[model samples]
Target: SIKIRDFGLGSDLISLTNKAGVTISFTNLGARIVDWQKDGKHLILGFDSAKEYLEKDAYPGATVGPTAGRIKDGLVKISGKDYILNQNEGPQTLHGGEESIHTKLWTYEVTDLGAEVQVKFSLVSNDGTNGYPGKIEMSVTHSFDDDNKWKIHYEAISDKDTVFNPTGHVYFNLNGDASESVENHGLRLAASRFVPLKDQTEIVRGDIVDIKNTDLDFRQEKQLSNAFNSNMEQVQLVKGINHPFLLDQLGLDKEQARLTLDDTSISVFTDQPSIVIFTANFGDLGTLYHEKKQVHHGGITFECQVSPGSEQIPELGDISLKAGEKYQATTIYSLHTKL
Candidate 1:
C-alpha cells in the first residue's frame, strides 16, 4: 500500500500507504519539499529537512523561483544591468532569492515514484537576479498517480534573455486535520478576474478584477464560507491568497481544467492559470504531526502558480523566456474516494 520513488535529480519521494499514510519528499536543489507523512504521521508544514529546507530561516516549500510571486522592488531591468535583489518580502523580491532554488542541492534518482531527483539550479543575473535577466535553468519533474495524482512537470530554459516564473508551492489542507479549516471545504476556481492589489502592492495596470460578489468568490462550488468573508480588498492583502491569479488563458491551451477541492478525505484537481489561495496564514507543526497539529492560521494553500509576478505584467500575460525556448508547466495533486 506504499511505493514512492523518484530521481530526476529533483530528488523525489512521495510515499503513502493503503490510503493516508501520506508521504511526500520533493527536492530539486531546493525546489524543496520534505517528508510529509500522515498516517505514519510527521506533516511538518514550516519545512525542516533537506538541509533545513534551504535555510531561509528554515523552510516549508515556497521557492518556486526565478520568480513565483511578487517582484516589485526586486527591480528587474535585464541586460542593460540594473539588478538589486534579496529583498525577501517587505520591499519585495521573494521566492527566488535568499538562496534561490528553495535552498539548493538536488541530484538523485530512483524513479517509479520515490526519487527521480535531478538538480541544475542556476541564476546568473550578472545584471539581474531580482531585477531579472538571462542565465537560468529552472527545472522540475515529479510524478505519481496511484492515490489519484501528484504530478508536477516543469521545464525552464533561459540565457542571454530573462523573465520566467515557475510554480508548485504546496500548502494544502483537504482536511488533513489541523482542526479542519478549508472553511467547509467544497470549492471551485476556474477564475474570472483576480489581479487586484494596488496601494503599491502592484498589479494595478490592467487589473482583471472580480471575486464576484466577494467573500473571494471561488467561481462556484461554494462553502469555504463563500469566500471567507468577502469584502475583498484583495482579501485584506495576504490574510489569504499570497497573490497571483488570472486563470483560463484559454484554459491553458485547452487542457481545459481549472480546480476542484472536496473534503472527507481529499480531492484536488487543476489546469492552472491561477490558484494561490492561502489559508494557513502562518504555519507550524511536524517533527511530523500525529494527532495532527499544524497551527498559526491552519490549512489551505492552493498555489498552483504562473501569474504571481509574470515578469511585471507583460500585457498581463506571458512572462518571456528566450534561447531555444522550452518551458512547459503543469500541476496535479489528486487524491480521492473519501467514502
Candidate 2:
C-alpha cells in the first residue's frame, strides 16, 4: 500500500497505491503531492525535481497555512492583543507570507486501514513564528481508498488564540495533458455566495455577495470558458477565476464543487465553509512537471478552508481558534471515469 524510494533530487519519494489503482506520490519537502496518477498519466501539475519546488513561487500541491488567503493590513487581534503579520504582498500578507509551512519538510506517519491507506504529515510552528499567536501543532493527512476517493485531512491545536486555516494548494488537470489549458474543463459549485474582490489587484472587497446570475455563478455545470471569456466585471477583474465560493454545509455528505475534463470528473466534498478556486491565472516558472510545462490556466485548483479574509468581513464570520481548541477540516475529492 506504501512505497518509499529516492526521488533522485535529494528527497525521498513516498507513495500510496490504493485498491482503485490510483497512486499519489509525495515528497517531504513541503509535504507536496508531486504526482496524482489515475491511469498512466499524471493528473496534477507537479515538478520532477525537489529543487524546482524551492525555485517556484506558486505553491503547487503544497500545504498552505496558518491561513490560506491574504490578510488585510496583516492585522489580527487575538484576545485584545494585536499581532502583526509579515506583509509580503504589498500591505497585506499573502498565503501567510513567503515563510509558510508550504516550504517546510514535514514529518510523516502512514496508517493502513484495511483497503485504504493514509499518510499523515505533521509539523509545528512556534508562538509568534510568523508574528501570529500560539504555538500551533498541525498535521496534513492524505488518505486513499478503493472508491477512488482522495481525502486531505487537516488538524491543528493551538496554545493561544490564533487563526488556523490550512489548505492544499493543488492544481488539477484531469486529462493529464499539460499542453492544454483548463478553459475547456467544466466546473460547478454548490454555492450561492462568494467573497468578492475589489479589482485587478486581487484584494478582497471585505464582503460576501450573492452570485446568482453573475459570472461567479457555478450552480450549473458549465465549461470554464464561459467564465474565463466573460464580459462580467468580476471575471474581467482578475482575468480568470480566483475567488472563494461558500459551501452549503460541512461534512462528506455535502458536495461543494465539481470539476470535470472529458470522461473523468472529480467531485469535491469538504467540511470547510469555503473553497477558493484558482484557475492558475499565472503559469508555472517554465519548470517541467511530468516532463511538461503548464501555461496559464493549464490547471485549476480547489483550495478548501475557512472563509478567508473573514477577520475583516463580518459577513464571513470568525477565523479564530481559541486556546486549547482543536481545529479540524477534511476535504475529499472523489474521482470517477465513464470510459
Candidate 3:
C-alpha cells in the first residue's frame, strides 16, 4: 500500500501493486528494484535503505549501463576515435565504472494499466558524463500483472555514437531464503555458446565458444550445484559462473532462460542477444542484508544484454549505437509457483 516514499540517499521508493497479490518496489536511484513480493513473501534480495545500496556497492537491484559488462582496459572505440573510461576493476571498466547509471537518480512515471500499474523510470546522461560521448536518454519500464508476470522493457538513444548494453542486476532466490548458497536452484539456458575466461581474471579470454563438452552447457536444465561441484577449469576461473551465454537467437520473442527453486520458478524472455548468468561467487557483502541473511551467493542474477567483450572481439557482435539510432530491448519474467 505504500506506493511512494523517501528511500534516503537521494532516492524515492515506489511500489506498484496489481490485482493479484504481487507488489514490487523500486527506487529512482538507478531505477532499482528494492523489493519484490509475490503471494505475500519476498522473492528477491535487497537492502532496507537506499543508503545501504551505495555503501555496499553490491549493485543489489540496480541497472547496468553504457555497457553491461567489463570493458577491457576501460577502452572503447567509436568512429575510429579512442576514448578512455573510468577503470575500476583492475585495468577494465566494470558496469560503467563510478559514473554508472546505477548511481543516478532517475525520474519516474506511474500509469494505470487497467488491472496493473506500470512504472516508467527515465534518465538522461549528458555528453562525457562518465567519459562516454554524446547526450543519451534511457527509459526502463516495470510492470507486474495479476498472473504474476513481470515485464522489463528498456529503450535508449544517444545524440553521439557510443556503446550501449542496458540490463538489470536484480538478484533472486525463488525459495525466499537468501543469505545461503544457491547451489540448489535449477537453471536452464537457451544458450549453446559461452564466453571463455582467462586462467585467473574475471575478464573475457576470447570470443564466445561452443558450450558443448563443457559444464557451461545449460541446454538441459540442472541444479546449480552441478556446476558449483565441478572441477572444470572454467568453473575454477572465478569460483563459479560469471560468463556470458550467446542466446541461440538474436531476437527476444522466446524464453532465454529458466530458474527454479522448490515450488517456485521464473522463465526469462529477452530480446538481447546474450545473457550473463552470475552465481553470486563472492563473499562478505560489507553490510548485513535487510533480512540479516548471509549475503554470499544468496541469490542469482540473469543479465540480458549485448555480448560482453564485443568491443575487441567482433565475433561477439555489435553493441554500438550510431548517432541518433534508437535501441530497444524487452525481457519478461513469468513467475510461477506450485505451493
Candidate 4:
C-alpha cells in the first residue's frame, strides 16, 4: 500500500493509502480528524476549506487550551486573581479563547510511516489572556503507529498556578460522508455519571444520570436519529451534553474498553476516557455543495478528554497543572477494516 504520511504544525495532515484505496486527513494541531475518504469518495466529516473552520464553525480541530469549555462569562479565576479572556462564543469562552493553540503553527519532524513533533506554544496572561492565569508552556504531540493507531499526547507546564483543562475537539463521522448526517450511525458511550448544566449557568456534578431509558442513553448501540429531542431538559442545556461524564469503571484487573466506530470499510477503536458524541448542531456551515448539491448535515464529534472545566463544574480530577510540572494525557485511535 502506498501510505502517504505527513504532519502539520498543529494544523492538518492527509493520509492516502494507495493499496487500501483510502484517504484519512486529520487536523492534528486541532486534535481532530477532519476528513477520511475511500477510493476518491468523500468520506465526509469536514469541509475542505480552512476558512470555514477558522472563522466560522464551533470548534473544528481547534486545540482548546489553558481552560476549555465555558468559564462563566469568560471570568477565569487564577491564583487569587480574576482573568478575562477573549469572548469568542458570546459571553462564554469557547476553545481557549481567540488565541487558542489550535490556531497556531507548531514545529514538526517527519518519519517514514508517520511523524513525531512537539508543538511548543504558550499563553501569557498577565492578569489573564482569556480570563485565565499565569503564563503557560504547552507541548502537544500527534503520532501514529504502524498498527493503524493514532495517538495524541498533550503536556504542559505553567509559570503561574491556574486552572487548566486542555482537550482536543475532534468530530468523528464514521460513515465518512461529511455531507450525510450522522443520524444513522450507531453510538455507545461508557460514561455512567454525567454533569448536568442548567441554562449553562449552574452545574450539577456527581450525578448518576441514566442513559438506559432516556434519549441520553447510549450504553447500548443507538442511532443519532432523534438524538435531539428538546423535550428533555438536558438536551436544551447548551444544546447538548457539554458536561463531563465518568468513563466506565474498570475492574482491578481489567482496563476500560475504549469506543469503537465501524464505518463502511473501516473500524476504529479508542482508549480514551469518556467519548463525547457531538452532532454539528451549533456549527455554522453555510450552504456547501455535496453529492452534486449544497448540503450541510450534522457532523459527529468524538471528544476523548478529561472532564470539563472547574468553572463549569467541580474539578473532575485536579485539572490544575503546576508550573514546571509537566502534565501528560494520552489518547489513541486504532483503525481497522475487513477489506
Could you tell me the TM-score of candidate 4?
0.76
TM-score to native of every candidate shown:
0.32, 0.95, 0.95, 0.76
The C-alpha local distance difference test score for the whole of candidate 2 amounts to 0.82
Candidate 2: tens digits of C-alpha lDDT, residues 1-339: 789877655667788888777888887777778888976877888877677787765499888888888887788878788878988888788888766888887888878896888888889988888787779998888888888888888889999889888788889987676667888888989988888887655778877789888776889899898889898777777778889888766677887788888888899998877889888776454545666676777888899887777777866768889989999888898888886
Go through the candidates in order and give each one's C-alpha lDDT: 0.55, 0.82, 0.82, 0.54
Q: Candidate 1 versus the native: TM-score?
A: 0.32
Decoy 2 TM-score against native: 0.95
Query: How many pairs of residues collide in each model?
Result: 35, 0, 2, 12
| lDDT for predicted candidate 3 compared with the true structure | 0.82
Ranked by TM-score, the better of candidates 3 and 4 is 3
In model 2, where is the ten-residue run with the lowest total lDDT?
Answer: 282-291
User: What residue runs in model 4 are displaced by over 4 Å at the alpha carbon?
Assistant: 1-22, 26-33, 41-44, 113-128, 200-208, 236-243, 250-273, 283-297
Candidate 1 per-residue lDDT over residues 218-292, each given as its tens digit = 566566655656556665565555555566544433432323344233344445566665566544432233335
Residue lDDT tens for model 3, 1-339: 337888997689998776666788899899888888877777887888877888765497888887888888889888898899888788888898875889889999988766667789999988997788869888999877777778888888999999888788988876666656778888998889888876565678876689875677789999888888888888877778888888886666788888888888889988888888887776665346665656556678889887788876788888888889998889888888775
